Amino acid sequence: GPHMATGQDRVVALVDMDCFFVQVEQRQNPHLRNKPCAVVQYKSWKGGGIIAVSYEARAFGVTRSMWADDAKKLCPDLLLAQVRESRGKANLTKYREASVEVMEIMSRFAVIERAAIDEAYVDLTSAVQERLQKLQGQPISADLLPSTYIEGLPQGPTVQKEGMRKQGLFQWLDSLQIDNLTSPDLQLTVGAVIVEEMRAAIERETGFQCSAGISHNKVLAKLACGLNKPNRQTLVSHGSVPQLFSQMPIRKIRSLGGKLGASVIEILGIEYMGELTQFTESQLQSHFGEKNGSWLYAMCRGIEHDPVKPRQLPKTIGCSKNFPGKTALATREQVQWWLLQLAQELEERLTKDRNDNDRVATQLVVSIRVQGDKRLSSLRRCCALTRYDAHKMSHDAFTVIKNCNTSGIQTEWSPPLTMLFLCATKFSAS
DNA sequence: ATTATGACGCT
DNA sequence: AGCGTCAT
Ligand SMILES: Nc1ncnc2c1ncn2[C@H]1C[C@H](O)[C@@H](COP(=O)(O)OP(=O)(O)OP(=O)(O)O)O1
Ligand SMILES: [Ca+2]
Ligand SMILES: [Mg+2]
Numbered sequence A: 001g002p003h004m005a006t007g008q009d010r011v012v013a014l015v016d017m018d019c020f021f022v023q024v025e026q027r028q029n030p031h032l033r034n035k036p037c038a039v040v041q042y043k044s045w046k047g048g049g050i051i052a053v054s055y056e057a058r059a060f061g062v063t064r065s066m067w068a069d070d071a072k073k074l075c076p077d078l079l080l081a082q083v084r085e086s087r088g089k090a091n092l093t094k095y096r097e098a099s100v101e102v103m104e105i106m107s108r109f110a111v112i113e114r115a116a117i118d119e120a121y122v123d124l125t126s127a128v129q130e131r132l133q134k135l136q137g138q139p140i141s142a143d144l145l146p147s148t149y150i151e152g153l154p155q156g157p158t159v160q161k162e163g164m165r166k167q168g169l170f171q172w173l174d175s176l177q178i179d180n181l182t183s184p185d186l187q188l189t190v191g192a193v194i195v196e197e198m199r200a201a202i203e204r205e206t207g208f209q210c211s212a213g214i215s216h217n218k219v220l221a222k223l224a225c226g227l228n229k230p231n232r233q234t235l236v237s238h239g240s241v242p243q244l245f246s247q248m249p250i251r252k253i254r255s256l257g258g259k260l261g262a263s264v265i266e267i268l269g270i271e272y273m274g275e276l277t278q279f280t281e282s283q284l285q286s287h288f289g290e291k292n293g294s295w296l297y298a299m300c301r302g303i304e305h306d307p308v309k310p311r312q313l314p315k316t317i318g319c320s321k322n323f324p325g326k327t328a329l330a331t332r333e334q335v336q337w338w339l340l341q342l343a344q345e346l347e348e349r350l351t352k353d354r355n356d357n358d359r360v361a362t363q364l365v366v367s368i369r370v371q372g373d374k375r376l377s378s379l380r381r382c383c384a385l386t387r388y389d390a391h392k393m394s395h396d397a398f399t400v401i402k403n404c405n406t407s408g409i410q411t412e413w414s415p416p417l418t419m420l421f422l423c424a425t426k427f428s429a430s
Numbered sequence B: 001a002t003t004a005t006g007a008c009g010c011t
Numbered sequence C: 001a002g003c004g005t006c007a008t
Helices: A020-026 A068-074 A091-110 A125-135 A161-177 A184-205 A218-225 A240-245 A257-268 A271-276 A281-288 A291-299 A332-357 A389-405
Strands: A011-016 A037-041 A049-053 A077-082 A113-118 A119-123 A147-150 A210-215 A233-235 A317-322 A327-333 A361-369 A379-384 A412-429
Touching: A011 A184, A011 A218, A020 A037, A020 A049, A020 A068, A020 A091, A037 A068, A049 A068, A091 A113, A091 A119, A091 A184, A119 A218, A125 A184, A147 A161, A161 A184, A184 A210, A184 A233, A210 A218, A210 A271, A218 A233, A257 A271, A257 A281, A271 A291, A281 A291, A281 A412, A317 A332, A317 A361, A327 A332, A332 A389, A332 A412, A361 A389
Parallel strands: A037 A077, A147 A233, A210 A233
Antiparallel strands: A011 A119, A011 A210, A037 A049, A113 A119, A317 A412, A327 A412, A361 A379, A361 A412
16 A cells, blocks of 8 residues: 555666667668668578568568578568678677767766667656756647657557557546646656657667667566567556556566576466466565565566666677587687687777777686587686787687697697687776 | 677576 | 576
């Protein structure tokens, strides 16, 4: 009753650029705009691996993790843009710089947590308070929410998509004007007005469109964002949670898409997030651990307390290459040459990072995969990162991994290496 | 041969 | 510290 927390204290958004690498390439090459197109890395093996897909191409069934040759079977007119190759490997610099464009615009509106290259959480609580102070009791016009969906509406007593969107929005605003909603609902609504403004500024100033979710915490905002894509935003209110979760597969909630979610389904014999409400907190903790159990108990009721962390920059800078199948590295010369290529890219990115962001990395992490090992990483070793020098970093990485070579012949490397990874970590201000 | 990243938890 | 999990 009067003491039960409802997790309605914050306004949180999740902004997700639509098919981001595709939009970067379409901005650069207008011939790709408004077409089925995809971004591919490499080309020799089966036409290259697809890593991003325009919504027009998705309509044909093109997905990521698809070979370009196969996507062409589904969409013969599919256009492709290739990721730049430098030093013999894919180089993602263009997309990192475009990401910085968008992150810097978002930072003008509120504190952001960079969640991925194309994804940021936004803590809008304070901005909403300010905007409400400016509004001074003035109602919110539907014109301020031209791309907003209210999840769960319309309901109760038009066959077009936009018509439904407007009907639900009208019902929501009508009940806010009449005072049949809560103060959290108004806070979320103002949050959505701000997110409309943020998304308009991103598109105006970069050309890039995005979707967004607005709710009371990060998990609901993330879930909301995916409900109406592309180029739309979705408000998930606290009151919408019971119906939304009643048919929501557990795997759709962030962090439950893998082994833990599968175990939740198997151990409890449930399918949907809402079914979790029937277990006590102690029950969930007994199956899934103290932390996971408390998190699940609150989350299935729409409550989550994870803060939007004030972090616009990545915490690590890494360079990685797989050497699949027959291309696995089998000589020492090979391993050293590729460590050097990775280390040269890393040095370049680190020097740029130091100049832009007033920080220096102090730890170098070296990871490898050996042929046959099912795990993504077979071995990880750290050493001190004391100079931004590619030859030193590559020599140090070799030193930390050289004892993995079983081969009795110094010149040969066995088992062959199927992945090399160098990562700079533990930044300090400079 | 579903690549190149990136964050974070466990012990 | 090194490994595992989850996601983009
Ligand atoms: N598995 C991956 N491997 C490599 N790059 C990826 C991978 N997943 C995503 N990316 C890249 C390309 C995407 O443009 C960008 C953002 O990822 P993601 O949000 O999942 O999809 P998306 O932005 O391409 O489409 P959507 O609009 O549905 O979000 O990061
Ligand atoms: Ca995206
Ligand atoms: Mg994303």
